[PDB]
């Protein structure tokens, strides 16, 4: 494979002025200071940038880059995007299931994975966890090899690497680059961007491209840059790294000075002559969804801390609540305690559903990388991640809370009431989680999303029906009560609980009211709060939640679909 | 100044095995891999480590290190501990006020500062802000020079630097080290720890100390390490950095192998012979408190975002509350709304007082560095930081909330009630803030402290007196209500508000109760909640808060006094 770029000029303001070159099978490095187009040219060559600002032409074996390019070309990110909770084998299996063709057999996929593991030298760690915060894992030198394998699964002909050594140690980096050279000798074109290498690394390059401030200061074989700069009016003393020597020149031991010098250099003429010589989904929806769900559930189980903790907190809180409110009485204090406990349950569901902000925020970069690479669609990823994480870990706390507190407190002893309470808690949890996803989808920082969620839930709680009577609010403001999830949940719980209750011992208020200001039945309390006594007055609330869910889960999707992938 | 260390062996497990050497006026560098005692020997020489594990002897001009050592010796940290909100002049003024003697005149201090600024070359930025998130500031290359000036204020004879170039760019680092050499030529002993330098840096060193895995692989002039390793059985090729060459040897291109080789080397014999040749508060409390307070208040004003935001939120929330609860009525719904609004106010104060976790956590490292260096005592720092940040920014929100909502709602129209409400809000805010400080003092991560605060406040809210009646709780649990700040605040507010109110129109319940289950007066509501009607029953709550404050503000102090400074 030969990748030739001619008269590239990318503008966002401009970052690359005018760049020409070719890259043949072997080791091709792109060096320079951080400001220069060291990392931008790599994205441009890799089709990971918006073609809108691109000007020049990129060609492969004489043909332009097809739309099938990013699928046949591997790109390794600087930082890790491997699932630290899986194993070195599981990550490769997931990559192979979505990057390879379905025509193949699982045996063929396993053979490909075995060959890749053997080539990389991961045989002894093939079944060990890559590692996370809670989980002890492999060293940072083999995570990189796992990431490289995830791209070699498809056996591409061109391999792009963004700073493969940054973060690693010297002895690790040397081994990594020796491995890369061994790969390149097989007939692969490796193109990478390094940051201030050492000479033990510089001695391995087969081609060098030096960029500074968007200008090409040199392009050619890496072994002749020393001679070029020696003959250009500079001298390097002994025991000085040539890679450090180049950046020392660039800093000043002017940009247009070096640019013009190279444009008048012989290498520029050779590159221009060579460039003028030539020019002159994969899988089904169900498969993607199944595999995404499997990976997400493996990650959920393999991180027992942050999921078991929620269950433990739920159980403890439920027991405390059942102890404090034990034995609700049908007396003057029954109304207060019933309303208070239901209010606390509802608001606690809403506030505990703030952790959903972490769902699509922690794994944003991985999602973008895998979508660009053609793993799956947005729909399948979204549905699978909902089906694996949100659904089971939001359905369970409600069941636990209800099963624990319902009989300790001594609420309405009917089966239908029990299950209605359970279902209402479930719905309020789902609605709050969906709202959190909608607010936090596409972002990358948890803090602002969490703060906004907290503020919105605080105002919702104000408009729930305990702190303020909803029939006393002014007309020009009351409508806001229809934007409150807690209101619907609390209303449904009250309707289910208070209907056939008496709260004035010795007095038959159900028949008649002796005194007008007594509040001796649940119906009176409900009507005084503005609640409808018909069965619709219950189920209404539920539908109002369901619609919310739908709406929010739609917005989130549209915030992922229209999200900038470049 | 000549610093000689003999037979140093520090144990925590051991980190340094056996180290000998001397450091004379000039540039003395300590190189090696990260695992080695590169940074530990620097702390040991600088007396910034616990002498408990130390074994050998450290000497200065033949005399051991006095207790007055760290005050006469400068230590520059790797990362910045300069106040990004002040100016380059203000930081030096603060350093000079506490590190210099009070006998001097402000004119003399200003002259010293001017001389330091001139020597460093900060004349053109002497009155520009160093820079924070919100504030644009100076480049990273001059923050380091400001930090160096903060230590040169006292004009020490020995200057320690921990990785002065890590984080900086090449051109910045070269200038920094040239500045250090220019300083050293005046007659100062500079001792620093570098991480993999470049040859343009290595050519400046006057003495080198190579450590790996707690072993001394070489000590002597930096210009002869090349010859030593050449004659020791190794060869360096051209265009290879000697500093990279040494670490390449250490990694393996064994630890005891090199250790023994050096122990049998000539340099070890010379060092041992030389070592056997020789051996064989500043200011008043009020001044410290005043200056700490001034700096903290300057930082508070110079960060208007996170302080103005709280005021804006307070005003907005107060207006919303006054609009929702506008015109409280003396009818069936007056009790509910009054209780709800008071409950919301109290819990909002408690939950908004969570930001105090940031007080002593953000500036932990600066506090430790300045305490070790002899700036001030713990008492003065603690009191000043309380007096500058907590007091004014917790006193104001209560005043705003009260002044806004009291008359929109239409609460008890008396002056004493107004001021009692204000004072109660203030006290609850202070108590919650003190609890947060006690929980978060000495830590370094905000997340766990915030979570613990939230949980504690949730349980406190449960035991406040609205969600559950406190007279219905079982005896083996009711006592917990005495650990609730919101309970005391809410009780005081209720007592102040409900006393002389009627809530049943057309009915004179104050005289007699026609029906037993009516709740037509505030006294009945209060007694039904378990509240005492005597004036003590009000002020009691306040004292219960005051004690809390004291206790918490004591615990925090003891968590700073017994905090590990090393």
């Amino acid at each position: 494979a030969v990748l030739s770029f001619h008269n590239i000029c990318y503008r966002v303001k401009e970052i690359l002025s005018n760049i020409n070159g070719i890259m043949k099978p072997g080791l091709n490095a792109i060096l320079g200071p951080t400001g220069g187009g060291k990392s931008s040219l790599l994205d441009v060559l890799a089709a990971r940038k918006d073609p809108s600002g691109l000007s020049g032409d990129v060609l492969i074996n004489g043909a332009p880059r097809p739309a099938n390019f990013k699928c046949n070309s591997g790109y390794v990110v600087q930082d890790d995007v491997v699932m630290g909770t899986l194993t070195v084998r599981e990550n490769l299996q997931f990559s192979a299931a979505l990057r390879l063709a379905t025509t193949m057999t699982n045996h063929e996929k396993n053979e490909r994975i075995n060959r890749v593991i053997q080539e990389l030298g991961l045989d002894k760690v093939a079944d060990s966890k890559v590692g996370t915060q809670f989980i002890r894992g492999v060293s940072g030198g083999e995570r990189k090899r796992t990431s490289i394998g995830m791209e070699l699964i498809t056996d591409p002909s061109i391999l792009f690497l963004d700073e493969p050594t940054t973060g690693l140690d010297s002895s690790t980096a040397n081994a990594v680059l020796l491995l890369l050279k061994r790969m390149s000798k097989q007939g692969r074109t490796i193109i990478f961007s390094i940051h201030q290498p050492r000479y033990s690394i510089f001695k391995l390059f087969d081609s060098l491209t030096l960029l500074a401030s968007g200008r090409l200061m040199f392009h050619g074989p890496a072994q002749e840059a020393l001679g070029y700069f020696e003959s250009a009016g500079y001298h390097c003393e002994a025991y000085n790294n040539p890679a450090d020597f180049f950046l020392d020149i660039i800093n000043g031991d002017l940009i247009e000075k070096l640019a013009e010098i190279y444009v008048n250099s012989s290498f520029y003429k050779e590159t221009k002559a060579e460039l003028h010589q030539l020019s002159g989904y994969t899988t089904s929806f169900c498969h993607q969804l199944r595999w995404v769900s499997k990976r997400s559930f493996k990650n959920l189980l393999g991180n027992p801390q942050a999921s078991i903790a929620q269950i433990i907190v739920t159980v403890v809180l439920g027991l405390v609540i059942g102890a404090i409110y034990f034995g609700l009485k049908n007396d003057s204090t029954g109304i207060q305690n019933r309303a208070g406990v239901l209010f606390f349950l509802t608001t606690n569901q809403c506030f505990s559903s703030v952790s959903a902000v972490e769902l699509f925020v922690v794994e944003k970069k991985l999602f973008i990388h895998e979508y660009i690479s053609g793993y799956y669609r947005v729909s399948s990823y979204f549905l699978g991640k909902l089906l694996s994480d949100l659904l089971p870990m939001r359905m369970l706390p409600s069941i636990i809370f209800t099963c624990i507190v319902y009989f300790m407190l001594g609420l309405k002893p009917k089966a239908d009431a029990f299950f209605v309470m359970m279902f209402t808690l479930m719905m309020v949890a789902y609605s709050a989680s969906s709202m959190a996803l909608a607010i936090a989808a596409g972002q990358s920082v948890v803090s602002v999303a969490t703060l906004l969620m907290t503020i919105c839930f605080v105002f919702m709680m104000i408009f729930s029906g305990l702190l303020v009577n909803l029939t006393t609010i002014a007309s020009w403001l009351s409508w806001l009560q229809y934007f409150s999830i807690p209101r619907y949940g609390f209303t449904a719980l009250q309707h289910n609980e208070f209907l056939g209750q008496n709260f004035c011992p010795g007095l038959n208020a159900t028949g008649n009211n002796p005194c007008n200001y007594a509040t001796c039945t649940g119906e009176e309390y409900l009507v005084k709060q503005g609640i409808d006594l018909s069965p619709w007055g219950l189920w209404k609330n539920h539908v109002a939640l369901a619609c919310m869910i739908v709406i929010f889960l739609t917005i989130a999707y549209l915030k992922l679909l229209f999200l900038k992938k470049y | 100044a000549v610093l000689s260390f003999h037979n140093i062996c520090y144990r925590v497990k051991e980190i340094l095995s056996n180290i000998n050497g001397i450091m004379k006026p000039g540039l003395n560098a300590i190189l090696g891999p990260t695992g080695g005692g590169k940074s530990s020997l620097l702390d040991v020489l600088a007396a910034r480590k616990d002498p408990s594990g130390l074994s050998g002897d450290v000497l200065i001009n033949g005399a051991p290190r006095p207790a007055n050592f760290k005050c006469n010796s400068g230590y520059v940290v790797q990362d910045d501990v300069v106040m990004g909100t002040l100016t380059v002049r203000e930081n030096l003024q603060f350093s000079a006020a506490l590190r210099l003697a009070t006998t001097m005149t402000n004119h003399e201090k200003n002259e010293r500062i001017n001389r330091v600024i001139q020597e460093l070359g900060l004349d053109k930025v002497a009155d520009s802000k160093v820079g924070t998130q919100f504030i644009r500031g100076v480049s990273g290359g001059e923050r380091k020079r400001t930090s160096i000036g903060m230590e040169l204020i006292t004009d020490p004879s020995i200057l320690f630097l921990d990785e002065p170039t890590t984080g900086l760019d090449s051109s910045t680092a070269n200038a920094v080290l040239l500045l250090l050499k220019r300083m050293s030529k005046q007659g100062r002993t500079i001792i620093f720890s570098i991480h993999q330098p470049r040859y343009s840096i290595f050519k400046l060193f006057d003495s080198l100390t190579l450590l790996a895995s707690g072993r001394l692989m070489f000590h002597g002039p930096a210009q002869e390490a090349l010859g030593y390793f050449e004659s020791a059985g190794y060869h360096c090729e051209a265009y290879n950095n000697p500093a990279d060459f040494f670490l390449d040897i250490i990694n393996g291109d064994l630890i005891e192998k090199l250790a023994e080789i050096y122990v049998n080397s000539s340099f070890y014999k010379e060092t041992k012979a030389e070592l056997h040749q020789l051996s064989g508060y500043t200011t008043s409390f009020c001044h410290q408190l005043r200056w700490v307070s001034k700096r903290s208040f300057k930082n508070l004003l110079g960060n208007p975002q996170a302080s103005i935001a709280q005021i804006i939120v307070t005003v907005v929330l107060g207006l919303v509350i006054g609009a929702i609860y506008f015109g409280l009525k003396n009818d069936s719904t007056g009790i509910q709304n009054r209780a709800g609004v008071l409950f919301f106010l109290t819990t909002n104060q408690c939950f908004s007082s969570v930001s105090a976790v940031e007080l002593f956590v953000v500036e932990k490292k600066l506090f430790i560095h300045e305490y070790i260096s002899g700036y001030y005592r713990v008492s003065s720092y603690f009191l000043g930081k309380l007096l500058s940040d907590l007091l004014p920014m917790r006193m104001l929100p209560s005043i705003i909330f009260t002044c806004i909502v009291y008359f929109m709602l239409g609460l008890k129209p008396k002056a004493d009630a107004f001021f009692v409400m204000m004072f109660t809000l203030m006290m609850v805010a202070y108590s919650a803030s003190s609890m947060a400080l006690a929980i978060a003092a000495g830590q370094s991560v905000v997340s766990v402290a915030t979570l613990l605060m939230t949980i504690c406040f949730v349980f406190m809210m449960i035991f406040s007196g609205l969600l559950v009646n406190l007279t219905t709780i079982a005896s083996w649990l009711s006592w917990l209500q005495y650990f609730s700040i919101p309970r005391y605040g809410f009780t005081a507010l209720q007592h102040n508000e409900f006393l002389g109110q009627n809530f049943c129109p057309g009915l004179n319940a104050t005289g007699n109760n026609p029906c037993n289950y009516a709740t037509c007066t505030g006294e009945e509501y209060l007694v039904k909640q378990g509240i005492d009607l005597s004036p003590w029953g009000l002020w009691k709550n306040h004292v219960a808060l005051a004690c809390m404050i004291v206790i918490f503000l004591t615990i925090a102090y003891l968590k700073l006094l017994f905090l590990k400074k090393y």
Partner: antibody, heavy 118, light 107 residues
Framework: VQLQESGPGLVKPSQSLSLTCTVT?????????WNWIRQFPGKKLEWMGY???????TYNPSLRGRISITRDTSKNQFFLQLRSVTPEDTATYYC????????????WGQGTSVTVSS | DIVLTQSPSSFSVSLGDRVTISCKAS??????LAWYQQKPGNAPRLLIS???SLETGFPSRFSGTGSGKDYTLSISSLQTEDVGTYYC?????????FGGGTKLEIR
């Protein structure tokens, strides 16, 4: 509105005590609450508990698990069962009525004496 | 709970005289105070409710006055049909409690 007690006037220790109150002039499932009170020798009144018109019941905490109050609407009666009796709870027992809107014990029975001996 | 205390466990008066009985509570009662009269050989009979109201069937010689924790029953110009035992009851909290009782005598 017209209450009448009945039951054994003598009981063995730690066995049981059962009294019955019959109501005439009113239906016990309609409006009021129905209480049991006892008066010790050396006159001292003690409220034991009640059963409400809807079947709910409430008991004095000083009688922990020893007392149960039941009813039979078929013939308008309510019963008091005090178990694990001791010679200290020898007293005169009354059944009484509680309106609730007024708060006071308006109607009382004639009272029956109970002696716990052996 | 709430314990009601009657200080004069016994009294001694003569016809036409005025007598006063006091009940003191350990907690606020809010006029949920009742007074019962008991003769020897009969069940208690309600005499006063609400601490001020008088029950139909009794003369306008008994009066009730109180507030907070202190309440009093005044019998002015007592007769011979007024001798007996008098009990104060509170019906504020569910464990209703009676007083110890005050017995009237005749000199």
């Amino acid at each position: 509105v017209q209450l009448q007690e009945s039951g054994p006037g003598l009981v063995k220790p730690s066995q049981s005590l059962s009294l019955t109150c019959t109501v005439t002039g009113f239906s016990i499932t309609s409006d009021y609450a129905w209480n049991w009170i006892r008066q010790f020798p050396g006159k001292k009144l003690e409220w034991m508990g009640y059963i409400n018109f809807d079947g709910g019941t409430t008991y004095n905490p000083s009688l922990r698990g020893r007392i149960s109050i039941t009813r039979d609407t078929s013939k308008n009666q309510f019963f008091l069962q005090l178990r694990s009796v001791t010679p200290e709870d020898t007293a005169t027992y009354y059944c009484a009525t509680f309106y609730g809107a007024k708060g006071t014990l308006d109607y009382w029975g004639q009272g029956t004496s109970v002696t716990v001996s052996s | 709970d709430i314990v009601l205390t009657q200080s004069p466990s016994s009294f001694s008066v003569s016809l036409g005289d005025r007598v006063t009985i006091s009940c003191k509570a350990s907690g606020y009662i809010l006029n949920r105070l009742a007074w019962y009269q008991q003769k020897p050989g009969n069940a208690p009979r309600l005499l006063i409710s609400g601490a001020t109201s008088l029950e139909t069937g009794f003369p306008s010689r008994f009066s009730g006055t109180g507030s907070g924790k202190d309440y009093t029953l005044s019998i002015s110009s007592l007769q011979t049909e007024d001798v007996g035992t008098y009990y104060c009851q509170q019906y504020w909290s569910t464990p209703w409690t009676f007083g110890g009782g005050t017995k009237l005598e005749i000199r």
